[PDB]
Amino acid sequence: MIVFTDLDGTLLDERGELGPAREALERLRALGVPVVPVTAKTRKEVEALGLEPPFIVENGGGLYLPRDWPVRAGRPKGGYRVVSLAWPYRKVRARLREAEALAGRPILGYGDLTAEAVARLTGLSREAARRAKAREYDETLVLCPEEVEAVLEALEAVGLEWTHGGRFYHAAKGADKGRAVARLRALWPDPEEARFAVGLGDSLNDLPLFRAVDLAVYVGRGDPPEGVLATPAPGPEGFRYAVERYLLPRLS
Amino acid sequence: MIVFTDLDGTLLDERGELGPAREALERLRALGVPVVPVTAKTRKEVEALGLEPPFIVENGGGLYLPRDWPVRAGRPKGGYRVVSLAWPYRKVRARLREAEALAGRPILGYGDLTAEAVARLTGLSREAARRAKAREYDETLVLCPEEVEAVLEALEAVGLEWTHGGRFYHAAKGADKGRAVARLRALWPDPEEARFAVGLGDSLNDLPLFRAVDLAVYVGRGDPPEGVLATPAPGPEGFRYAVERYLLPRLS
Numbered sequence A, B: 001m002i003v004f005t006d007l008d009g010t011l012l013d014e015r016g017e018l019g020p021a022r023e024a025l026e027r028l029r030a031l032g033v034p035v036v037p038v039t040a041k042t043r044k045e046v047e048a049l050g051l052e053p054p055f056i057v058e059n060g061g062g063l064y065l066p067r068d069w070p071v072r073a074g075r076p077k078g079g080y081r082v083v084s085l086a087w088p089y090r091k092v093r094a095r096l097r098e099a100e101a102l103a104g105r106p107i108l109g110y111g112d113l114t115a116e117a118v119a120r121l122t123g124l125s126r127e128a129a130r131r132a133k134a135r136e137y138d139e140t141l142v143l144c145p146e147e148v149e150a151v152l153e154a155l156e157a158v159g160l161e162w163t164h165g166g167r168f169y170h171a172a173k174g175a176d177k178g179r180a181v182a183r184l185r186a187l188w189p190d191p192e193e194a195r196f197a198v199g200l201g202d203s204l205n206d207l208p209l210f211r212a213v214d215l216a217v218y219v220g221r222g223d224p225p226e227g228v229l230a231t232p233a234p235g236p237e238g239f240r241y242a243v244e245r246y247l248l249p250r251l252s
């Protein structure tokens, strides 16, 4: 059993902390159950959280493995081995300029904004904003609500893909949480262990995650998507519930 | 006679060049007629055009005098004395953050954007974008079209003023071309020379300039505001016609 889980609004609280998750998290670890972050966040953001590989960054664009991963894959990053699944950021940004020319109105993302602007926009510290701006694959977009429809069409027209992270739209090519989860499972040292996967998430960018797992759980704020399971309370308390009620019993 | 002139679309062509206005400027210079740029550009942009003081920047936000101006006014800054008529950029920016809170909606301006983004949005080179970003008084805003109304109301609620410059909205407090012109005329060394003022502009937002001068000339496209003289052709060619027909004969 491997647990794949979103961070913001799933495992992390309203200020990116943990909440009751410590309880549940420490429990899974004690039982030897691998927990794998699958997030829209960047590697720098994941590192600042103290999280260790394997983890999946930027909506599936990068899959990070420990340096000594028993299954040889990806390229060395000094401490890691990286499996790049998506186009690099610079290519997404270039292609975004063409979407913008097509749309005939500004299309702004994180790459266009100062760390100060991103911090003000998100409520983050200046430092956290710099880490969110250090993107390798995926662009976070800051779109006008009424321009969204025209913008998404322009993205499609120029060969980009889009998703929604909970507050912001994202643009990328080849980044998909489920594709990254499938790749990691296929690279797992213990095939029997990987044969059963759990997925927890809260946003549109997590539908690909739910479809790639065997047991899917929605701890988001609204109604569960097609056929996925639910919890009494959202976020980290929904996470704790899922572990106690859905997971532990399946460990027999 | 003092000639006050708008730059872009008036004294400069669509390439930022002088064209037929070059000979006209030389002619005025030869007759000792002072010419005073009145522009929405920053001091850094004006310097890159190689223009010497006196000149008026950022839509009347600031009046730049030569350091040795015979009338003592403004604050010494290198080879200038600066008469600040508007609130400083830093204060406008602070007020913008207050407005953003009130509007419950992001309000993005040049200060939030990289030079690269400003360049992309304006068609400028990165270097010219950097000079466009070195603002001392007014902020250029990049507003969502369906959000303008609410944003503008919030700007006013926090004591800011706004205008629409043709492409973007602008925010400032106390920046008014007409007031800057009246001030410079009041600070003119020779009161007799300052009693007759010419204003040339190419846009409807030059109206404050047109009101503060005695002879107002519009070289833009379509019809001039009521009370304002027009020329057969637009831009620098109109500037040329204006000097020849209205100014030159008057100097004899």
Ligand code: VN3
Binding pocket: A006, A007, A008, A009, A038, A039, A040, A041, A165, A166, A205
């Ligand atoms: O950690 V997430 O909001 O994809």
Ligand SMILES: [Mg+2]
Binding pocket: A006, A007, A008, A009, A010, A165, A166, A202, A203
């Ligand atoms: Mg999330």
Ligand SMILES: [Mg+2]
Binding pocket: B006, B007, B008, B009, B010, B202, B203
């Ligand atoms: Mg103009």
